[PDB]
Design a protein around this ligand. Structure first.
Ligand SMILES: [K+]
Ligand SMILES: [K+]
Ligand SMILES: [K+]
Ligand SMILES: [K+]
Ligand SMILES: [K+]
Ligand SMILES: [K+]
Ligand SMILES: [K+]
Ligand SMILES: [K+]
Ligand SMILES: [K+]
Ligand SMILES: [K+]
Ligand SMILES: [K+]
Ligand SMILES: [K+]
Ligand SMILES: [K+]
Ligand SMILES: [K+]
Ligand SMILES: [K+]
Ligand SMILES: [K+]
Ligand SMILES: [K+]
Ligand SMILES: [K+]
Ligand SMILES: [K+]
Ligand SMILES: [K+]
Ligand SMILES: [K+]
Ligand SMILES: [K+]
Ligand SMILES: [K+]
Ligand SMILES: [K+]
Ligand SMILES: [K+]
Ligand SMILES: [K+]
Ligand SMILES: [K+]
Ligand SMILES: [K+]
Ligand SMILES: [K+]
Ligand SMILES: [K+]
Ligand SMILES: [K+]
Ligand SMILES: [K+]
Ligand SMILES: [K+]
Ligand SMILES: [K+]
Ligand SMILES: [K+]
Ligand SMILES: [K+]
Ligand SMILES: [K+]
Ligand SMILES: [K+]
Ligand SMILES: [K+]
Ligand SMILES: [K+]
Ligand SMILES: [K+]
Ligand SMILES: [Mg+2]
Ligand SMILES: [Mg+2]
Ligand SMILES: [Mg+2]
Ligand SMILES: [Mg+2]
Ligand SMILES: [Mg+2]
Ligand SMILES: [Mg+2]
Ligand SMILES: [Mg+2]
Ligand SMILES: [Mg+2]
Ligand SMILES: [Mg+2]
Ligand SMILES: [Mg+2]
Ligand SMILES: [Mg+2]
Ligand SMILES: [Mg+2]
Ligand SMILES: [Mg+2]
Ligand SMILES: [Mg+2]
Ligand SMILES: [Mg+2]
Ligand SMILES: [Mg+2]
Ligand SMILES: [Mg+2]
Ligand SMILES: [Mg+2]
Ligand SMILES: [Mg+2]
Ligand SMILES: [Mg+2]
Ligand SMILES: [Mg+2]
Ligand SMILES: [Mg+2]
Ligand SMILES: [Mg+2]
Ligand SMILES: [Mg+2]
Ligand SMILES: [Mg+2]
Ligand SMILES: [Mg+2]
Ligand SMILES: [Mg+2]
Ligand SMILES: [Mg+2]
Ligand SMILES: [Mg+2]
Ligand SMILES: [Mg+2]
Ligand SMILES: [Mg+2]
Ligand SMILES: [Mg+2]
Ligand SMILES: [Mg+2]
Ligand SMILES: [Mg+2]
Ligand SMILES: [Mg+2]
Ligand SMILES: [Mg+2]
Ligand SMILES: [Mg+2]
Ligand SMILES: [Mg+2]
Ligand SMILES: [Mg+2]
Ligand SMILES: [Mg+2]
Ligand SMILES: [Mg+2]
Ligand SMILES: [Mg+2]
Ligand SMILES: [Mg+2]
Ligand SMILES: [Mg+2]
Ligand SMILES: [Mg+2]
Ligand SMILES: [Mg+2]
Ligand SMILES: [Mg+2]
Ligand SMILES: [Mg+2]
Ligand SMILES: [Mg+2]
Length: 56
RNA sequence: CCUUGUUGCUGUGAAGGCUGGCGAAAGCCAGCUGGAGGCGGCAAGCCGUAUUGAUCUGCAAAUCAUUGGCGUAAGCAGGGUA
RNA sequence: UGAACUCAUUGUGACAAGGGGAAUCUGACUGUUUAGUAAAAACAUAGCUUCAUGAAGAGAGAUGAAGUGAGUUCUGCCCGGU
RNA sequence: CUAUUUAGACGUAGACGGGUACGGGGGAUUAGGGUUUGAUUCCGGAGAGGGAGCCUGAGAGACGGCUACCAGGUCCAAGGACAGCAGCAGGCGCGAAAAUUACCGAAGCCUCCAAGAGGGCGGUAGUGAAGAGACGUGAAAACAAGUGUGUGUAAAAACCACAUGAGUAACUGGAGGUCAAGGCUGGUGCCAGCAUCCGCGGUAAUACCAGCUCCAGGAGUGUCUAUGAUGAUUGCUGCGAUUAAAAGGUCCGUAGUCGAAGAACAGUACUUGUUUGUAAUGUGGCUUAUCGAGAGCCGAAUAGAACGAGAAGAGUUCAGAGUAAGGAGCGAAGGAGGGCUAGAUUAUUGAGCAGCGAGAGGUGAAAUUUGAUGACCUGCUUAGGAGUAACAGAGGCGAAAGCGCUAGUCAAGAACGAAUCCGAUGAUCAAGGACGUAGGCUGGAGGAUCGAAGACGAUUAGAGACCGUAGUAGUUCCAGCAGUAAACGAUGCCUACGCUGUUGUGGUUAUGAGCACGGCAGAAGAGAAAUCUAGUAGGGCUUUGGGGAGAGUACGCGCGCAAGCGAUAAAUUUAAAGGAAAUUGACGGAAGAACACCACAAGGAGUGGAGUGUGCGGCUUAAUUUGACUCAACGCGGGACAGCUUACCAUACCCGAUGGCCGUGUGAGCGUAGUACGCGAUAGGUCAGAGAGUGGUGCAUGGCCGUUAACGACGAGUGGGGUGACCUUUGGGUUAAGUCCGCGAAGUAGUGAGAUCCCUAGGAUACGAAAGUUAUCGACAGGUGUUAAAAACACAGGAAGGAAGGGGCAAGAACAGGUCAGUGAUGCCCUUAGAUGGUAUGGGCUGCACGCGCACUACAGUGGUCACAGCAGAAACAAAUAGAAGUAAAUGUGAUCGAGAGGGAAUGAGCACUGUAAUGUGCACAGGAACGAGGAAUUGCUAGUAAUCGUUAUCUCAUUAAGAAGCGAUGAAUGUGUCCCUGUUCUUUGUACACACCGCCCGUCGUUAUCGAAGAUGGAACCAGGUGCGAACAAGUGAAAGCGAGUGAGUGCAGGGUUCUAGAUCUGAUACAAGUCGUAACAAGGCAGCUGUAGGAGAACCUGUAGCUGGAUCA
């Protein structure tokens, strides 16, 4: 029974190209760690609930 | 059917037997002894495959040469008898 | 059974004396046959199966008649015609 | 090595052959016990393209020495010459795979005749994210990498010191679960892709492709491939074998592994001391480079060996010792244990004869078939070959397979009783040996009954099968071969420790009990449960399993006359497996109760046939708008359409929340007999954004309906049982109903049923003066008779008698059941001034070859026609001269008509009514079609019911009922039952079904792919041997010429041993979305299934014979 290869690549053609927006140089090493440690202060409490990423 | 004549040389090595080893048994493996067979190679013989050889006014109204088949046997043969 | 020495072509010196292998058709084997154009795959053979009979100077492990052809493995269906 | 003598040497504790390998010190992982690796700094071995010979030397069978062959090369003047990178750089190939044709009088060492010469050995840098350390990528005031001097070295560079500039510096994999971190926004719609595994995507994708935010590790992070761990899935420590994979059919037996008490003895294992035995690595430490790997120094150490010591266990011996260890023997007794000899009561067939005179046989029902040549049945005679009924059992015997009449005879064994004898003789078992139901095979005897194969008769779409008739090999015996069974209690053999009650068999007994061999019922433990040959446990020895498939198959080998049997692989494929036990449902051509005119029995009226009314399909058309399809679509959508309804078709006309921007009284736009007049913000254009739609999707919904079902079920709290999913427990009587009565590991309250409510039947003491109305009352199986309870019936009184009759309301759970065309109920998609929005005039919804559903008039005389009466539910009715809506009709009496004067279909010219419009309705005259009681089928109905007969001040409605929803008149037949059919509930039981029987599933045939066997004839390599021939070198002998043992490379010719590969054709397996023919298995799966063996057959499979329950029976 018939088979064909006519459709290879389709979705990569049809998805509209969007440009990457600019951003700062991010931290690295201990610098990144001081930044994370201040954000997560709630979580280091044994009560209440932190949430890393929410879209509401 | 009755009475008789006619087996020389060699190869292979069945049944039965004795020793030695192995095995708990049953019975297996060596070496030797023994000498069976419409069994192998030949002799005397009996036969008749090939050369489509010789001969075809013959040696001969069926022979001759070389080459072949069997040859310890449902083998070959004289006389008497049906 | 060994070893050495020896020869100018080498030694079963003349005579006597197997060519061998791979396959197929066919008949099991040794044996027999068209005397005088056919030796064969034809005939025979051991084994297998069928048939008829209580009659004998013979008595069913007997006496005669047919067919197939050693061994191994198989041998299906039909009694309408004769 | 050679001469003569002796036959040895080595093997199941694995010889010999073949395959494979540099060996250790050490490395990786690791709680412990282990599993894997070692070309690779140290030690020892071998080699220098492949083989072989050799001179020199203290030392080589040397190759940066020589000589010859074989395979390859280089230069030439063609005559000859030279050469070997598994040294250091370097090049080409091969591969998925690995650096510079660099500097060196310095460090560590080696070589010479040396106050010096040589060394790619060694050292120094360059190159590369194989591995291992320490740190950058900012701080809150103030941060690498640069540069210059000095150092450093053999010379350098880097490193370090001081001094100058300054302000540079993160990526890889992910975000549904395992597994840390987004239902975010846009594309795509089972596509494209993602995903180790599970799984995503069919237009609402937290999983694809991208954007944006998060997470993890970080100068690093992902992937592929080997291995160690995970893993008690290789089990010494430490798994399993009743049913999941797994105890050999039973004995004997060698090698092997394992073996009393008592008294003594000896030291080789065993354990331990002292001394040896380890550079590096590793282990326990300390000291110096800024720190940390690194470097330097210290201490102890494995296996192996030398010499002493201790004697528990192991070992050796002894007999004034004699196992609930074995063998020999004695006494009395028991048993379908075995071989042989001689007898037996019946039965089934066959023949003979006698009696009788028509059928026998066989089945669910029948046919083949046999009988007047006398069957069948009843007598008497006989001839054979099998078998031992009832007694006969959770009884006995045997190693298992197996063994059942009575006597006599011949060997051996088990158990019991007891002061007999010998003394370790024993347990288990590869190899080897003996037995083994049935069916089968080789030869003989025989042949009653039964019966594979083969042949018929039936049944079926077809039966080749099941059933019946018949019939052969076999089924019996003797002498052998064979070697399998669901050969099963699916539970190896010895030996232990272990609770109670009861019942057997054989001996013995102080009569209390024991010993051997059993059955049964609990308990406690155990186990995933079911259950227990399964409890406790490092006792000994053998067999044996490691996810499904392929496969107990291929090749080789051993046995067999054959049939075959024993023993046993790879390639390939796949996420689970009709794997195990239990639980809840669904189903059964399973069992037992119930129930019901949408079930039947007993009956009564029809429908299906004709003509017409109406709906549905099909076809036609400009359009014939559309939903709905077993009950539960089809006079249904309140669907009786002239307009409207109306969604469809033809033509024509009409319109637009708000906000921004722009443009406007010097006039946006509008009317017109459209160009110059009238009216003026109202209604302009463009972007956003509303709203509207009988447009789409009920598989995006709400609400409401229908159906299960009008059925008996339905959940909560507390207690009980089970590891759990889950069950609340024994199913006996009753009702319409888990409605109730009994009884219980359960008990208490509720929903559903009943009660209540509404109508119909009886009832003033109230109200009225009109004569009726309404009514808190009346019936409860209450009374009698039926001897548990709950109940039921038969009588009797009573207006009314067993839910008084009829309605209405009416659990939980469900269904992708219906409706978006009821809705200012509604999500999302679509259209929106040339509209899918309104309006108007017309046309269609009503078209007609034809198949269906439901109704209405009929087929006459139990009728038709004329007239006359006369009666409902109660109360409504201008007028009308042929006739043109209305207050019953069947019916009662008299006439008439007389067997198509029954019947009114298609149609003619008229006469009126409703209406905006006839196409709709009424009336009169003509006309007079089929139909003479309906094939296969099919629908309701138990009493004021069915059927008959009219009527609606009920609904539709201007006009239209042959439709519904009511209402009254006349009024039966038969039963008062049953579970046979059709279904529905409950309880038991089986299951390979859960998507739930419309389920699931087996095998041929045909088509594709992929991997493997065989096969006439063949190719390659690569090893060792056997024969030829023989280059180089050569001891010896010779003045010499020569001659030449021996060591041998190469090469002839035959063979073998290994590994690959070709091959016409045949034959397996696996995957085939769904092709063809049947339906073999799972329910008593429609003939209960399965194991062995033998025939047969399109194919699953069918048939004979013996066996098993894993069976549909613990009886
Ligand atoms: K001889
Ligand atoms: K001639
Ligand atoms: K002459
Ligand atoms: K010769
Ligand atoms: K000669
Ligand atoms: K012959
Ligand atoms: K002969
Ligand atoms: K001849
Ligand atoms: K014949
Ligand atoms: K013959
Ligand atoms: K034959
Ligand atoms: K015939
Ligand atoms: K005949
Ligand atoms: K020259
Ligand atoms: K070299
Ligand atoms: K090199
Ligand atoms: K590399
Ligand atoms: K350095
Ligand atoms: K990223
Ligand atoms: K993403
Ligand atoms: K999305
Ligand atoms: K395994
Ligand atoms: K073990
Ligand atoms: K066996
Ligand atoms: K004893
Ligand atoms: K006996
Ligand atoms: K037998
Ligand atoms: K048959
Ligand atoms: K037939
Ligand atoms: K039959
Ligand atoms: K029969
Ligand atoms: K036997
Ligand atoms: K045997
Ligand atoms: K077996
Ligand atoms: K027993
Ligand atoms: K078990
Ligand atoms: K085989
Ligand atoms: K009818
Ligand atoms: K209807
Ligand atoms: K609904
Ligand atoms: K069957
Ligand atoms: Mg002689
Ligand atoms: Mg002879
Ligand atoms: Mg002669
Ligand atoms: Mg002759
Ligand atoms: Mg001739
Ligand atoms: Mg042939
Ligand atoms: Mg001859
Ligand atoms: Mg002749
Ligand atoms: Mg001749
Ligand atoms: Mg012949
Ligand atoms: Mg023959
Ligand atoms: Mg035979
Ligand atoms: Mg010698
Ligand atoms: Mg090494
Ligand atoms: Mg060397
Ligand atoms: Mg050499
Ligand atoms: Mg060298
Ligand atoms: Mg070097
Ligand atoms: Mg998470
Ligand atoms: Mg993901
Ligand atoms: Mg296991
Ligand atoms: Mg099983
Ligand atoms: Mg099993
Ligand atoms: Mg077994
Ligand atoms: Mg340090
Ligand atoms: Mg001891
Ligand atoms: Mg008779
Ligand atoms: Mg008896
Ligand atoms: Mg005894
Ligand atoms: Mg037999
Ligand atoms: Mg055993
Ligand atoms: Mg397996
Ligand atoms: Mg086998
Ligand atoms: Mg009936
Ligand atoms: Mg009809
Ligand atoms: Mg129903
Ligand atoms: Mg209209
Ligand atoms: Mg409309
Ligand atoms: Mg609407
Ligand atoms: Mg629905
Ligand atoms: Mg009810
Ligand atoms: Mg109770
Ligand atoms: Mg009620
Ligand atoms: Mg639906
Ligand atoms: Mg219509
Ligand atoms: Mg009439
Ligand atoms: Mg209607
Ligand atoms: Mg079936
Ligand atoms: Mg069946």
């Amino acid at each position: 029974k018939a088979i064909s290869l006519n459709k290879a690549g389709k979705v990569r053609g049809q998805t509209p190209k969007v440009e990457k927006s600019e951003k700062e140089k991010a931290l690295t090493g201990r610098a990144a760690w001081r930044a994370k440690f201040k954000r997560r202060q709630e979580l280091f409490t044994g009560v209440g609930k932190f949430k890393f990423n929410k879209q509401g």
